Design a protein around this ligand. Structure first.
Ligand SMILES: [Zn+2]
Ligand SMILES: [Zn+2]
Ligand SMILES: [Zn+2]
Lengths: 252, 193, 207, 47
């Protein structure tokens, strides 16, 4: 255990590895690896969307794009007012976790209805990827145009072909697999951070070898069945449970 | 399988490598299927040159795996770019080269090396992210070496063998080895059967 | 061993060439140095370890191979250096250089063209493969072995919530063993069992 | 409800620096929030 922790500290001192790789390679828990990364001075977005409006055959197509993956949601609006833009934004925020929105300085994007929807759903709106995605979507729409009768059907069929049929990039994935992988990784990080804060509200008094006096208050990092990892003096060390006393700490 | 590939391409208009992978068809049939439609790679490398501390870093990236190869140049001529391309072709199998509309990539020595090593040259969002990741690793381990050339080569080692990220969880060197080995066995099976 | 390399330095046309060879495949990397100092040798070893997985190095008792620069690069990249194939590859490389000597101006371009010829245009041996095909096959097989042992544990870190016969509550988190097309093998309290696919929910369960 | 008791106990501790059992018995709030009100004060210490 302690051999793995010292090997992980030496390896991070050379190459600055990440915590998932260190936890998988050196066989230590994930909270200890996250602490090793958090003690480094040289080591210290999944929810941002961009919106735009475009025209096709006298109809208004509104396109939202997820930036970190290239994922697309599109619609056909009856007009270009602010009420229909606010309804499209409310539907997008109901289906996906949206926290940061990037638009241009259009009229319908600068409106009281969009402002009220962003207030209720707690979105940060900023005025200034979507143009490249609009061009790629319109090439698909002219490619599969004769398989449909109306324009709304052709728009949704092109959204399906873009999201689940075109593969590329590094590993050769579509956009739907990339957005699900990105959001799942963020969910793992937030759950581990909750566990880290709940564990680190404690404090440890430990009794060193060949001494009968208790040492200073060391912060708890990991508590096992027979081992305890503590931080003391900018040092991590492993003390067994028979020489430890864990007490609550109120040091806010 | 040919009927399934024809119905799939009639609906969604997929490319030939997607049908050949997902339906297990030899590639000549899929190429002719895509070629018959009216409405319509493990050796593709992309190159770039950038600036850092008054030096010129030339960076070539294998696109199917994110495998990096960087050098610090003493000049931005055509001869040194051709020599870097010649060493890259002498180390790995290079068959498709992508670059931008630059001044050094359109020269007599670059065209002579591409003609001699049989590389298809084409001129036009992966190389920018690779340049950003290389600069961030260089600014991470800058104070471990004195000269900038050692810092570039140490960042190349850290990028190729010490960053295991992505959807699968693999480093870029193991990915390029698996990709070329799988393509070799696939072309061997299509030549045998 | 699939990660052993051997190094040497030679002279040709008044220059100094350095040659590193992967032993189990006969794979050649070679460059032209301006000098025989330890700094340029250590720079070549750093570039070689940055491009290919290098773990064990064999050299002769030279003057540049025994230096603090080479010791520093070997310590930082975690290579094991020992002092005592390369001469046979040197002889073959000189013969190829003399074969295509009238196609390049400098000797550096001649060394690089001979390296491309030796690595991808000289098929021989038993099976009939070149050097690049052999090195790619060998390192891929070694990767497959070690990653197999890690990947089985990765697939057993998932959690399954299943349903038995005529009880309408979802039972607790068994461990996944294999997920088929119409059946799932789970281990529940040291009991292996086979459940249909429509009666299972497979989570990773962060919490 | 005891949330108004939480606000009143914060004002009362800002004046008089009560202990946590006194605030828990007087304002009828649970013991965890009372120990937290003591813990966030820089001058006091829960004991
Ligand atoms: Zn660090
Ligand atoms: Zn087609
Ligand atoms: Zn107080």
């Amino acid at each position: 255990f302690l051999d793995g922790i010292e090997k992980a500290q030496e390896e991070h001192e050379k190459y600055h590895n990440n915590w998932r790789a260190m936890a998988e390679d050196f066989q230590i828990p994930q909270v200890v690896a996250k602490e090793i990364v958090a003690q480094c001075p040289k080591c210290q977005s999944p929810k941002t969307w961009q919106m735009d409006c475009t025209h096709l055959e006298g109809k208004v197509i509104i396109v939202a794009v997820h930036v970190a993956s290239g994922y697309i949601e599109a619609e056909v609006l009856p007009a270009e007012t602010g009420k229909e833009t606010a309804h499209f934004l409310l539907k997008l925020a109901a289906r996906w976790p949206v926290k940061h929105l990037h638009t241009d300085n259009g009229d319908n994007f600068t409106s009281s209805a969009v402002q009220a929807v962003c207030w209720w759903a707690q979105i940060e709106h900023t005025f200034g990827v979507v143009e490249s995605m609009n061009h790629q979507l319109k090439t698909i729409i002219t490619q599969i145009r004769d398989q449909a009768e109306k324009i709304e059907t052709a728009v949704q069929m092109a959204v399906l072909i873009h999201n689940f049929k075109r593969k590329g990039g590094i590993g050769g994935y579509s956009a739907g697999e990339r957005i699900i992988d990105i959001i799942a990784s963020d969910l793992q990080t937030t759950k581990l951070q909750n566990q880290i804060s709940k564990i680190q509200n404690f404090r440890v008094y430990f009794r060193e070898g060949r001494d009968q006096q208790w040492k200073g208050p060391a912060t708890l990092i990991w508590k096992g069945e027979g081992a305890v990892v503590i931080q003391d003096g900018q040092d991590l060390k492993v003390v067994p449970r028979r020489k430890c006393k864990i007490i609550k700490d109120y040091g806010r």
